[PDB]
Swiss-Prot record, chain A:
MVP repeat placement: 1-52, 53-107, 108-160, 161-213
Gene name, Swiss-Prot/TrEMBL: MVP
Entry protein name: Major vault protein
Domain remark from Swiss-Prot or TrEMBL: MVP 3 mediates interaction with PTEN. MVP 4 mediates interaction with PARP4.
Tissues showing expression: Present in most normal tissues. Higher expression observed in epithelial cells with secretory and excretory functions, as well as in cells chronically exposed to xenobiotics, such as bronchial cells and cells lining the intestine. Overexpressed in many multidrug-resistant cancer cells.
Segment of the intact protein contained: 5 to 249 of 893
Inducing factors: Up-regulated by IFNG/IFN-gamma.
Cysteine disulfide links: none
Reported function: Required for normal vault structure. Vaults are multi-subunit structures that may act as scaffolds for proteins involved in signal transduction. Vaults may also play a role in nucleo-cytoplasmic transport. Down-regulates IFNG-mediated STAT1 signaling and subsequent activation of JAK. Down-regulates SRC activity and signaling through MAP kinases.
Modification(s) after translation: Phosphorylated on Tyr residues after EGF stimulation. Dephosphorylated by PTPN11.
Quaternary context: The vault ribonucleoprotein particle is a huge (400 A x 670 A) cage structure of 12.9 MDa. It consists of a dimer of half-vaults, with each half-vault comprising 39 identical major vault protein (MVP) chains, PARP4 and one or more vault RNAs (vRNAs). Interacts with TEP1. Interacts with PTEN and activated MAPK1. The phosphorylated protein interacts with the SH2 domains of PTPN11 and SRC. Interacts with APEX1. May interact with ZNF540.
Subcellular location: Cytoplasm; Nucleus, Nuclear pore complex; Cytoplasm, Perinuclear region
Swiss-Prot record, chain C:
Protein name (database record): Major vault protein
Job description of the protein: Required for normal vault structure. Vaults are multi-subunit structures that may act as scaffolds for proteins involved in signal transduction. Vaults may also play a role in nucleo-cytoplasmic transport. Down-regulates IFNG-mediated STAT1 signaling and subsequent activation of JAK. Down-regulates SRC activity and signaling through MAP kinases.
Summary of the tissues where the protein is detected: Present in most normal tissues. Higher expression observed in epithelial cells with secretory and excretory functions, as well as in cells chronically exposed to xenobiotics, such as bronchial cells and cells lining the intestine. Overexpressed in many multidrug-resistant cancer cells.
Recorded domain comment: MVP 3 mediates interaction with PTEN.
Residue stretches of each MVP repeat: 1-46
Organism, scientific name: Homo sapiens
Length: 245, 195, 46
C-alpha cells in the first residue's frame, strides 16, 4: 500500500502528517508514498465538462493574475469559502482538497424563439454593460440565445409570448409601480391594453390577464357603453363616470 | 503469453507499467512482449468503413499540420476530450487507447427528390459558404443530394413536399416572425396562401 | 516486495530481465524495483 499507480488523467489526495497539510497528485504516474504520509482515497477520474456544458464547484481555489493556484505558507491550498465558481468547457481540471462538486456536468439550456427567462439577482454585483445590479432586481433574458449561468443570478422561470391577432387588445395589469412600452407612467393595480399585432412578451412587472376581441358594428347594430371612470375615448370626446352613450 | 501474433490488418494495445503510458501495435507482425509490459485485450480487427458510409469515434486523437498523431512527453497519445470526429470512407485506421466508437459503420442517407432535411445547429460553428452559424439556427438541406453528417449539426426531421394543382391555394401559418418567398413580412400567427 | 530498504553499508543485486544483465545497488537507500526487474537475495553486509 506504499506503491500506487495513478492512470492517465486522474488524481489522488495525500495528507502529510508532519504539517497536517494536504495536496493533490495529478498525472499519469506511478506514485510512491512515504510512511509519514497517507493517501486519502482510491484514484478518481478528474472531471471533464464537455462543450456547451457547465458545472459549479463549491469553495473554489484562489488564483493569481496568471490564474495559478495559491498555497498557504504551511502548504495548504488557498480556498474561497461559501463561494462558487462558473466552470464552462475546458481541460480536465482536478479537484483539490476542500473542493466540493456542487452541480454535476449539466447541459446549458438554450432559450427558444418567442420566449424569455426571468432572472433575479440574489447577491449584488456589477453588470457586463457597466451597470451595478443591486440584489433583488428583475431581468428578462429573451430571444433565441443561450444563457450562461452566473453565481449571484438566479433564474425564476420562463415566460412564453402571447399571440395578438388583428382586432384584439390583450389587457395587462401591473405587479408594481412601473413603466410601459408606450413610454407612460403606470401604478400598482392599474390596467391597460396593448393593441400591437404579433407575439408579445410581458415585462417582469406586467402580467397577462386575458385577450379581448373587437365588437363588429353594422348598419343594423350599435354598442351600449358605460364609463367605469372619467376618461377620453377614441373620438377624443370626454366621458364622465357613469354616463352612457 | 509473451509471444503473440497479430494477423494482418489488426491491432492490440499494450501498457508499459514503468511510465504507465499506453500505445497500439499495428501491422502484420509476430509480437514479443516484455515482462514489465502487459497486453490489454485479444487482437481486434481494425475497423473498415466502406465507401458511401460513415462512423463517429468519440474522443479523437489530435493531429499536426501533416495529419500525424501527437503523443505526450510521457508517450501517451494526445486526445480531444468530449469531442467527436467525422470519419468517412478511408483505409482501415486503428483505434488508439482512449478512443471509443460512438456510431458503427452506418449508411449515408440520401435525400430523395421533392423532400428536404430539417437540420438545426447544436453548437456554434462556421459555415462552408463563409457564414457563422450561431447555435440554434434552422436550415433546410433539400434536393436529391446526399447528406454528409456533421458533429455540431443535428437533423431534426425530413419534410415532404405538398402538391398544389390548378385552382388551389394551400394556406400556411407562421411558426415565428419570418419572411416569405414572395418577399414580404410575416409575423407570428399570421396566415397566407401560396398559389 | 517492490519496496526494499537497504541499511547503510550493505548492498543487493538485481537482475534486469530485458537485457538479462545484472548489477549491484550499494548505499544507505530505500530501493524501489520495477516489475521487469528482480532482486536476487536479501540484503548482505558488504
Amino acid at each position: 500500500e506504499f506503491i500506487i499507480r495513478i492512470p492517465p488523467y486522474h488524481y489522488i489526495h495525500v495528507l502529510d502528517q508532519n504539517s497536517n497539510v494536504s495536496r493533490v497528485e495529478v498525472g499519469p504516474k506511478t506514485y510512491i508514498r512515504q510512511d509519514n504520509e497517507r493517501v486519502l482515497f482510491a484514484p478518481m477520474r478528474m472531471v471533464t465538462v464537455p462543450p456547451r456544458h457547465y458545472c459549479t464547484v463549491a469553495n473554489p481555489v484562489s488564483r493569481d493574475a496568471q490564474g495559478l493556484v495559491l498555497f498557504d505558507v504551511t502548504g495548504q491550498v488557498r480556498l474561497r469559502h461559501a463561494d462558487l465558481e462558473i466552470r464552462l468547457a475546458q481541460d480536465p481540471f482536478p479537484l483539490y482538497p476542500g473542493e466540493v462538486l456542487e452541480k454535476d456536468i449539466t447541459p446549458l439550456q438554450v432559450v427558444l424563439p418567442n420566449t424569455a427567462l426571468h432572472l433575479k439577482a440574489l447577491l449584488d454585483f456589477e453588470d457586463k454593460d457597466g451597470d451595478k445590479v443591486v440584489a433583488g432586481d428583475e431581468w428578462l433574458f429573451e430571444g433565441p440565445g443561450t444563457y450562461i449561468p452566473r453565481k449571484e443570478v438566479e433564474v425564476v422561470e420562463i415566460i412564453q409570448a402571447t399571440i395578438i391577432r388583428q382586432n384584439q387588445a390583450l389587457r395587462l395589469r401591473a405587479r408594481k409601480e412601473c413603466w410601459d412600452r408606450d413610454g407612460k407612467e403606470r401604478v400598482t393595480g392599474e390596467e391597460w391594453l396593448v393593441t400591437t399585432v404579433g407575439a408579445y412578451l410581458p415585462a417582469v412587472f406586467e402580467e397577462v390577464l386575458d385577450l379581448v376581441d373587437a365588437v363588429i358594428l353594422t348598419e343594423k347594430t350599435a354598442l351600449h357603453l358605460r364609463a367605469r371612470r372619467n376618461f377620453r375615448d377614441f373620438r377624443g370626446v370626454s366621458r364622465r363616470t357613469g354616463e352612457e352613450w
